[PDB]
Amino acid sequence: REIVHIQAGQCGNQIGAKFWEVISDEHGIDPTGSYHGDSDLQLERINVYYNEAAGNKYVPRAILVDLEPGTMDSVRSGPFGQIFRPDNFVFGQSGAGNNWAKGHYTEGAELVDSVLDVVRKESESCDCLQGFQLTHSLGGGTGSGMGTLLISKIREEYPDRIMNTFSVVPSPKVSDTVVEPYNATLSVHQLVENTDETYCIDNEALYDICFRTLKLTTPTYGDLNHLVSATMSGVTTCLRFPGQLNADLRKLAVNMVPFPRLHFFMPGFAPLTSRGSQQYRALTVPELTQQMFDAKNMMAACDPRHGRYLTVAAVFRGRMSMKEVDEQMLNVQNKNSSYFVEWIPNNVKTAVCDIPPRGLKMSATFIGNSTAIQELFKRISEQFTAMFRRKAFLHWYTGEGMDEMEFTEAESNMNDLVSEYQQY
Amino acid sequence: NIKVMCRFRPLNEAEILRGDKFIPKFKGEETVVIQGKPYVFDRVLPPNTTQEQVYNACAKQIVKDVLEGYNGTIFAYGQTSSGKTHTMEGKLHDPQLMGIIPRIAHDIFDHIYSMDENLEFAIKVSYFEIYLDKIRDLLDVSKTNLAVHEDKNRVPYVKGCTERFVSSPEEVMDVIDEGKSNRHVAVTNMNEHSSRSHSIFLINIKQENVETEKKLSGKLYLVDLAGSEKVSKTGAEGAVLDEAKNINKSLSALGNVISALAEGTTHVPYRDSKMTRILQDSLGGNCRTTIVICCSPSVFNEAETKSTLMFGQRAKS
Amino acid sequence: RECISIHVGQAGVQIGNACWELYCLEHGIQPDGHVPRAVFVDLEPTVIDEVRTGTYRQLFHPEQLITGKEDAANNYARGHYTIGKEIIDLVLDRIRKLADQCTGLQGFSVFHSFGGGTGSGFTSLLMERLSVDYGKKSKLEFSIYPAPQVSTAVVEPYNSILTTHTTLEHSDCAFMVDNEAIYDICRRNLDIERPTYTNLNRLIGQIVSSITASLRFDGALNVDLTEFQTNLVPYPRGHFPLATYAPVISAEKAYHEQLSVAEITNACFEPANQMVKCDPRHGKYMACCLLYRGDVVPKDVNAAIATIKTKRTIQFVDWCPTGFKVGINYEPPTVVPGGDLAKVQRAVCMLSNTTAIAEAWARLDHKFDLMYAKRAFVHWYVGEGMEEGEFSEAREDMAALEKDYEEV
Ligand SMILES: CC(=O)O[C@H]1C(=O)[C@@]2(C)[C@H]([C@H](OC(=O)c3ccccc3)[C@]3(O)C[C@H](OC(=O)[C@H](O)[C@@H](NC(=O)c4ccccc4)c4ccccc4)C(C)=C1C3(C)C)[C@]1(OC(C)=O)CO[C@@H]1C[C@@H]2O
Ligand SMILES: Nc1nc2c(ncn2[C@@H]2O[C@H](COP(=O)(O)OP(=O)(O)OP(=O)(O)O)[C@@H](O)[C@H]2O)c(=O)[nH]1
């Protein structure tokens, strides 16, 4: 099987560097080097993310889409930056304006064809394609607009292969941009109707989870990114490993989406202990479920405790008892019968790889489909209206060839999306 | 309220002794027996019920309400050889063998010119199919997708759908002939008509009150659901069997939730598919909806008829 | 004489590697000896690969190892219809190529995991295509049906109400081993909170060895495969008996090993030792096939059983005078060199049809409804060549399996 990552925008891009920083080491691939793999198993399934050309050069099969040179020229001028074949860099030296409209209708719409071109060169690579990974932020141009287009096109070209989306939904407390809800509401809209698996991460849900669950005092972006990339590795790549009970994107999809919206999840990693001290090793297993299922530790902003779950997928990856795994999951399902929805006898989807995260003994990625994420699109949707009402920075959209009915559309859509989620 | 009406088609002499025999036992005028089944639902039309009779119970009221500026939906379902073609249109000019759409067209133009002295009517017809979940206009078939936009209330409608004036019955027939000639039909034997594309025929009754400039706009959606089939296996067949299986199943599933929500359950899967955006004006506001289900004896028809039975039956029980 | 075997689904393959291990182990045929007599099917390569990478690597022919690099999908539909279809032909081909090479066979011991994608769906049509190509044989499918509370997949029931209805009209005798109810045995009758899947497999890997292996092996009271279905199914429903083993004692802790027949047989009817969470909560047995192996005196049995026949609290069906098929083999069991299985010199792998499953099916059917009642993950199958039909019409199916197991 296979997949083809997609680094839309700067963020989605910045993260690319971290997702690939990791993944590679979790596959023994040095900058341009080959497979130094401490083992021999980190190779029989690599294909999922690379391509064979030289014999020591397995190049990441991702796409780097962005209308701001400097960015990709920071990712390509640093560490692992020199592993992507230049063909991968689909830049847009234009003015990468922070407008969803500027990267979806006017500026991005041009650079698109020169992207799809490659997304096809990579898809028609070889073997059988599974789906595409998509990273970006719903709070900018090259991210929400242009990346949200990249998919609307992808999903017309292969309505068969899957589409996981890793979105950095606009954090609450403080917005790292101003129109944010504009660029956001507009991209979520596109999401709820193309990709079929979205993993929403919040820069501040991370800080928290990174400053109190990792006594880490100076959580640089690199970190946040790093933590995130840690989860997306547990998801995909991981399951493309052996296991007593293994799954793969689809299983994950076909066990997690009760209703076609696409629904968005909230990823959570397992061993999340501070370096030295904490290295408690309390990782027998009840310790991992202890972790994963708590409020804090959910990369999302919202707290599960604020709304039932529809599905859950503990994708563990480290030798354990299909008994102490299958078992724990249960008590968990009974101690919290309250929030776990009932019309699904077994919400949880236990998954079990074998080999764990390179240096760790036992981990377990969590992919929750809780109704709690209602209280986020609400947020976003609110911010919109409060500012839409006055058409705040709307001239930067319309003046870019947009519509007063376009914004209406999205909000409603994504706004209805809130509604539905409550229906459960 | 949504009402479910079963229509059995009769067998012809050539098939009474070929292989197709009765499986439908009728009791009274509202129960149909099949293996195990002690009550059905609201009404079962027997294999002795006229086209005219089906039209009175199912569409006559809906047409009346549409002329006062309300919405109405008539859904149609039934598999291959169940009698769908015979009920909805029949033969285009037949004095009593004609269907639903030619009768509505006759009743519309019998009020027009007999009751127009302050009303200025414009009957606009639009005909589109949903094929591979893309809206294909059937008045120009170089169109392979067509979009929705939203009205004044934020309710979606199909913008750009080619509409045309019709002011006598003939022009309505000409729109049907045009749309059917590009409908996706599987090449079977000449008798069978295997619909792989769901059809939405829109009759938009626009009437203008010329004295006050008040406009009314009743929408009659005649929705031909191809429906979910007793067909063969797929996984090494490159037919439009696999492609149809995905369309018919996605739309029938959305079906299930929509009656369940009509007979009660908080708002839910609107704006999910193009069908459910087209019929948005028809569903949830002041509307009426009739689902006409067909299914002949020929043993396979038992499959789709049981499908139409369960669409009904879950809700009222 | 023989009995092919088709291990379908990762699980059916893990269990397969296990049951297949125990085999050579008690037949003196190391890593590289003769040639198996089965096949391996899965729509996820990485798992069958484990049989291609790990132990018992060269004891198979890359021909009896079928894989569909494509996608598994924890959903019946996809595995049965859509994807699973593409492979079936090829699959069959082997069970027609391996079925020919032999000499007057008896059937195919099928190994699947009820609630999976490749295990539920696929097989569904595999057994399906068999019942027609060899209606004239035995179709005993050895299943690992859904843990009563500790299921895994979120959909599980969808996949198991569907593998039951499609296989029902095709199997001869379906053996059942409950994944959870086996853990209990690992906790209560062996002591270990560290049971790797690799263990449950060693277990069924045992109970199964008692079925085919040793039975198809000479003895003082041989029992053919046909024998089973005949002495084991009262009615055409591919009836599902339950597997049970007796000396499930720990090879470390306790040691009373020397537990004469009189004991090991009584240890079969106590509900805490039956590889199935179907505790005889009321289910009247209606036929048991007591397969013994090792040093056993026929009188010991034709007495130990007599004592039982008169315990009454073990109530057997009415319409059944005597329902005790005593199968005696010679060669004692053969425990893994150093796993955790005691290693006695006699055992009792008793399997049976018990009005008990009236439960297990019930509790698994109910599950289904709850979700179907909301369509839950329905869009996942529909979009995979299925319909409101197959579900609703497979529900009605089992319904008459809740009435059947009730009426009989
Ligand atoms: C001596 C020792 O055991 O050091 C550990 C360590 O101290 C701890 C604290 C690690 C450490 O992680 C962090 O401090 C961290 C920093 C930024 C963002 C997120 C986390 C560690 O840096 C991370 C590192 O993780 C790995 O090696 C995994 O394979 C992980 N790899 C990466 O994230 C990675 C980092 C740099 C470059 C390339 C990859 C991984 C996890 C999931 C999927 C794929 C890979 C580990 C175990 C450790 C150190 C090195 C200190 C922890 O994190 C992980 C992801 O394992 C933080 O809490 C856990 C518990 C670990 O015990
Ligand atoms: N006893 C036993 N049960 C197993 C084993 N592996 C899986 N199972 C059980 O069988 C079911 C899992 O089926 P999956 O592995 O998800 O799927 P599959 O049947 O192999 O086929 P796909 O869904 O297409 O991958 C669960 O109920 C597991 O508890 C095993 O090695 N031994």
Ligand SMILES: Nc1ncnc2c1ncn2[C@@H]1O[C@H](COP(=O)(O)OP(=O)(O)NP(=O)(O)O)[C@@H](O)[C@H]1O
């Ligand atoms: N009431 C009726 N009287 C006379 N002929 C009828 C009647 N109902 C159906 N038929 C005929 O029987 C066949 C079924 O017609 P239609 O062609 O009506 O089926 P469907 O539309 O049921 N088939 P399909 O679209 O393939 O799924 C046609 O040859 C019709 O002319």
Ligand SMILES: Nc1nc2c(ncn2[C@@H]2O[C@H](COP(=O)(O)OP(=O)(O)O)[C@@H](O)[C@H]2O)c(=O)[nH]1
């Ligand atoms: N986690 C994370 N968020 C980022 C990074 N870079 C920008 N963001 C977030 O992305 C949003 C801004 O969008 P941006 O990426 O600049 O848009 P674009 O570059 O025009 O496509 C803000 O909410 C930031 O917090 C990053 O490297 N990591």
Ligand SMILES: [Mg+2]
């Ligand atoms: Mg027809």
Ligand SMILES: [Mg+2]
């Ligand atoms: Mg599998």
